[PDB]
Design a protein around this ligand. Sequence first.
Ligand SMILES: Nc1ncnc2c1ncn2[C@@H]1O[C@H](COP(=O)(O)OP(=O)(O)O)[C@@H](O)[C@H]1O
Ligand SMILES: Nc1ncnc2c1ncn2[C@@H]1O[C@H](COP(=O)(O)OP(=O)(O)O)[C@@H](O)[C@H]1O
Ligand SMILES: Nc1ncnc2c1ncn2[C@@H]1O[C@H](COP(=O)(O)OP(=O)(O)O)[C@@H](O)[C@H]1O
Ligand SMILES: Nc1ncnc2c1ncn2[C@@H]1O[C@H](COP(=O)(O)OP(=O)(O)O)[C@@H](O)[C@H]1O
Lengths: 353, 361, 352, 128
Amino acid sequence: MANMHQLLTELVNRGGSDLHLTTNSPPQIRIDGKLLPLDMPPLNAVDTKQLCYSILTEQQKHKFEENNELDLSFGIKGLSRFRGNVFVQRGAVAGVFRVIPYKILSFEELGLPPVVRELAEKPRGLVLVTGPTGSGKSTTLAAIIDKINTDRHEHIVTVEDPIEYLHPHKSCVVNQREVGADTKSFKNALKYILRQDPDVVLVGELRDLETIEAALTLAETGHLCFATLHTNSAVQTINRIVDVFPSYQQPQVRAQLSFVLEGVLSQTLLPKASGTGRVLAIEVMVPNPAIRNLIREDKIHQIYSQMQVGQEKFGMMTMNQCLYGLLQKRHITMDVGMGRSPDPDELKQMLTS
Amino acid sequence: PRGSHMANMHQLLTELVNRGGSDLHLTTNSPPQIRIDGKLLPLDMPPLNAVDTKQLCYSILTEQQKHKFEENNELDLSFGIKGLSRFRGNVFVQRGAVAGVFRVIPYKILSFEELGLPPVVRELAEKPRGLVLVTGPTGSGKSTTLAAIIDKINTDRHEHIVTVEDPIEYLHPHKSCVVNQREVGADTKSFKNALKYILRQDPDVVLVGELRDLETIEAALTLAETGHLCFATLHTNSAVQTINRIVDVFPSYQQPQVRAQLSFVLEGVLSQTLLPKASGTGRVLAIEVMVPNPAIRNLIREDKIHQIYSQMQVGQEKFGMMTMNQCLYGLLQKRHITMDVGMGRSPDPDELKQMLTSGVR
Amino acid sequence: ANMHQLLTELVNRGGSDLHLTTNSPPQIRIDGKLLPLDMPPLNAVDTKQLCYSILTEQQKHKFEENNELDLSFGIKGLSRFRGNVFVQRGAVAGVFRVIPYKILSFEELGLPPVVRELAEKPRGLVLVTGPTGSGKSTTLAAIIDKINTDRHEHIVTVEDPIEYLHPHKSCVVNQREVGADTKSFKNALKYILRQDPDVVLVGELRDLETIEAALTLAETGHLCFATLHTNSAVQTINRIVDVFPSYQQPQVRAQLSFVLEGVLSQTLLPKASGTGRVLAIEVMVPNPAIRNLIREDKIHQIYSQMQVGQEKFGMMTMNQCLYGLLQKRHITMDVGMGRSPDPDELKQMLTS
Amino acid sequence: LGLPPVVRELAEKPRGLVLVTGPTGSGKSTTLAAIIDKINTDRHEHIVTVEDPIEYLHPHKSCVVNQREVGADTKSFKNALKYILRQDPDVVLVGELRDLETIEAALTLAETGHLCFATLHTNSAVQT
Ligand SMILES: Nc1ncnc2c1ncn2[C@@H]1O[C@H](COP(=O)(O)OP(=O)(O)O)[C@@H](O)[C@H]1O
Ligand SMILES: Nc1ncnc2c1ncn2[C@@H]1O[C@H](COP(=O)(O)OP(=O)(O)O)[C@@H](O)[C@H]1O
Ligand SMILES: Nc1ncnc2c1ncn2[C@@H]1O[C@H](COP(=O)(O)OP(=O)(O)O)[C@@H](O)[C@H]1O
Ligand SMILES: Nc1ncnc2c1ncn2[C@@H]1O[C@H](COP(=O)(O)OP(=O)(O)O)[C@@H](O)[C@H]1O
């Protein structure tokens, strides 16, 4: 048998993101998005209770037994910090434990093109980093924020659920607010953010109509606003913001977006061709004079054609062009690149070319 | 006058399985009774009293389950007997005494073809993300279809499946996935509470049960929008009727967001019903299948929900779609259902009449 | 002593309810009408002692807190009764109903032979309707008891309260009383499908949620019995349809057309002898024409179908039942005309 | 402040609801302080402000200016506006129209012959 400390050590050593402990299965660790069972006997109810309780204080145990649910974060000296969730299934304890990295990675390490570096220099605008869950959005935002913290003498405020990467003060003052502990909600944090003299604000996901307008106000009133969406492309991102409003407001919102939008990044993590690790495929839309006019005229669909031809001038890049490069460098397999292309026949034409 | 040598609960359930029974009954003033081929037959035992039924039923409850049963006088649960079988138990109260009913739960989950599900349902189980809705009235095969879908995912993927059920019906032992199943009223306090913590539990596939209220619908859309495969049920009878229920439960001012979200995340709508079989034994599945294509996704954003039915009529060949009448037509050519049942259940009897008279079949 | 002697009078004269209130002698309900006993009137002292003489100590403290109290109690050698005690004009008053225990047979109840066939249906919805005290529970108790004798199936009843008691015969019979065995009609039906039933009695179709349960039970392969307070078959079907919002009446009409197997609308009318009551019942048994009429929303046309499906299917309109009681001279013309839903047609039907 | 001449004429309106709206930090309180100061300078009336918190202070000039801070001077907007009609006011500043309760109170003040000033976070007249 192995205890909780040995299991967490193996999760870190193998570069995994998540450790799962549940009954009738061995401990499993998520490596590169897919689960892998550890070389251990299947757990029983005693094991899951013993392993999960081994990292809890007495009050955390008593709170867990009152609700059969528990969110927490904890540290193991000399290893890493982890965020754990404990719950109950089939009458037995179960647990999931997520890694919180100590180290912020650089732009080049993450495979982010240099145009993302320039967005950290934007004085006032809205920059959106979008993608499905676990597509690298938070790491890219943390990479941009750390460069601003390093390079500017301004005030950075983040509202996060939860706070992942920690930003010690460099040249900036960095305040990080965790929803549910430091602040009641995004709505509450955003209710007072304009009285907090911010320069750059990270608001998390544009969850509802009220948060879209709040992010638009910051970027339009002279601030640099960072936000995320769960869209898969630059065009789909712009459409989702506009389409949630009633049609007769929509004209105003397109005009505000055209002025404040300074960059849209859409990420996805694909399994590498070597069989270890994941590689970043990203679509980058940086508004040029042509695209900002297309936004105001509700000619959003001509943007894709403009992104296809504005790469050398503005550092723009369609998703298919990014997949193309990962195919040329043999970073991804042929099936993986096809499986994510929004238009596989277009990418096929590029490949035969 | 007989005492001190009563059959054990373990022994009663062991005899239930060995004799091929479907259900074990424990109630006062009756001996244990077993259902064989649909009919109850008493075992050659003395009749049970209230002490017997409570002691037998309590022998298979955890201490937390006894307290939950005593608070509501109702209790559904599942348990395993090592080396024998799994069981669904229901404990209730009648005439002031404990009563219990215990159903046999087979080890083998039925396949798509055994259930009469078209091959398009198979492909919905391969979706990497999105929302899949399985609809129909109570007992129209919704849970069984979902059990078949999750089981293929359990077999094929190395991902995390979490289900929230009230109660847990079909049980999913681990295959290639890690499967966590939370039972409302025992494992978790409520649907609302389980969904509040699910995103911190690293899920890939989630079963959320019925889209009961506005809170749950918003939770399922978030799961489906954030890159997850989310399974849910409604009690609507058609793909078009299903979409109308989702949008219309929301205030009018946020229907635009709901309509936009559905067009992106919706990957399939299955509307089932069980009709009495033509053979005279059992019921057979008639299912309407809507798989959103770019054309259907546009009608959702443009508030043209009504026009989707015309698209399903002509999406059978290309998209594997199937209107309810198109399924009833196929069941009639196969002589699986009678004519009165086919016409009497058709949502549009005029279309089905036209479909049969083609002379081209 | 005094109250125990009073309740024996109630049983011996065959009454249904005993009334105790100030400025009146004790009154007992016989055949639907109150009859005063040849006794002195009760004062406030009398009603208090009589009602309190049958109360437990916990019940005494409970009644004075609310001026209301529900209870049931037994009198050794007589019967059990359900009582309600309350306060009026500053004094205690009480009403006591008899809980019948002996189930009468189908023929003793005046039920036609077609009702006997209903207890042999394997699945569907059967509705027994009528005002309060129109004979629904005896009819239901007779039906349930025959199933218990003839079948090896599972009978579950949910009652508020339990009236007739059904010991196990060939069936397993579980009886759940609301407020003791189960919290509510809604809670019992939440678990009923997981209790492996074959025949279920759900009581009154009082709201939308219970109707969905009865229709679900009936189309999922069970025989479900339920009650309404309507006085005819058409009236009964309309009440089920009109409870729902307009946009789902097509689904409910479709459900009803398949699962409905019988509608019994009863009323107890005084016999021409002047002592006792005879049952008048409208029976609607769906034939292919009627089932189509329900789904096609031609519900008003159903009454015409019942008048001519009589010989073949055992059907009987209320007027046809009233004709027979008039032809056999069991009830008076005033009683028969008073219950006829269309007295002029009965007149045409009576004289040919 | 760059305010057009119509803003000064609004400060001379005898009655009604005048709304100065915009996002936070768009100059709403500064414009209101200039209006109230002009009213305070030119009129012999009673000004009551309900602010959360009090920003600009208005010492008495020709008007009587009472400024109530919520949480210290008064328990809430809801409680302060419940008694504002009993305080013989001519001009009332109620702050932001944050909920249904204050909006109906501000509409009642402006309906009963007072000049009421309030704010919203809207960006245009129609949107307001
Ligand atoms: N550019 C990247 N390249 C490779 N891996 C990345 C990259 N960005 C993030 N990751 C890794 O993906 C996993 C999830 O990252 P995260 O940013 O938290 O996802 P999300 O943005 O959807 O919340 C982590 O293990 C992280 O190290
Ligand atoms: N596709 C199907 N075809 C035939 N029978 C089915 C099918 N699905 C389920 N059944 C059977 O019908 C019954 C009801 O199905 P179930 O999904 O459990 O109820 P519900 O969908 O109303 O919640 C089950 O006992 C099952 O054996
Ligand atoms: N078919 C019947 N014929 C003669 N008497 C009946 C008949 N049905 C019921 N009764 C008597 O009338 C009384 C009312 O019956 P009950 O079923 O308890 O009321 P309800 O139908 O309103 O629930 C019973 O006590 C019963 O003895
Ligand atoms: N009409 C104006 N013209 C120029 N600057 C102004 C004007 N109004 C306010 N300001 C300046 O803008 C800043 C914000 O003013 P403030 O009243 O506090 O915000 P708000 O109107 O949203 O309450 C102040 O520092 C002020 O100096």
